[PDB]
Write a protein that binds this DNA or RNA. Structure first.
Ligand SMILES: [Zn+2]
Ligand SMILES: [Zn+2]
Ligand SMILES: [Zn+2]
Lengths: 63, 63
DNA sequence: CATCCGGTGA
DNA sequence: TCACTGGATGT
C-alpha cells in the first residue's frame, strides 16, 4: 500500500486493441505534465534534475 | 555440430546490460518468423501444429 | 513474468 | 514530453 507524491498523478490504463488488449499499464504525470511510462525513465528524470527528496521507490508502477 | 532444420534460423545472442550481462542465449526463428526463446515453447509449438517430422531434440538451445 | 521503450500512424 | 501498442529484454 503506497501513497502518490504530491502534485503527481498516477494513471492505470487498460489496453484496448492488439494482441495485448486487456493488458494494463501504469504511468505517472509530473506536476509539470511530463508523462513517465516506466520506473527507469522516471528515475533517469530524478537524476538529470538532482532530485534529492523523491526516490524511484516512491513510484508504484505495478497493478 | 548438430545441424539446423531447413528454413529455420538459429541465433546466438549476448546480454548487454543488467545482472547477467555477458551471458549467451540461443533462440530460433521459424520459416514464418516466429521466435522461440525456449525449448519448451518450441516443443509446444510442434504439438499445437501436429508436426510429425521435426523433433524438439533437433533444436539445440545450448551454447 | 515484469519491465521496458521503439515503431506506428491518426 | 503524442497516445497506444508490439515484442525485446533480463529476472
Ligand atoms: Zn500531498
Ligand atoms: Zn564438425
Ligand atoms: Zn536444408
Amino acid at each position: 500500500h503506497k501513497p502518490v507524491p504530491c502534485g503527481w498523478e498516477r494513471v492505470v490504463k487498460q489496453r484496448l486493441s492488439g494482441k495485448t488488449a486487456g493488458k494494463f499499464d501504469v504511468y505517472f504525470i509530473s506536476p509539470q505534465g511530463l508523462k513517465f511510462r516506466s520506473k527507469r525513465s522516471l528515475a533517469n528524470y530524478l537524476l538529470k534534475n538532482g532530485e534529492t527528496f523523491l526516490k524511484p521507490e516512491d513510484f508504484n508502477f505495478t497493478v
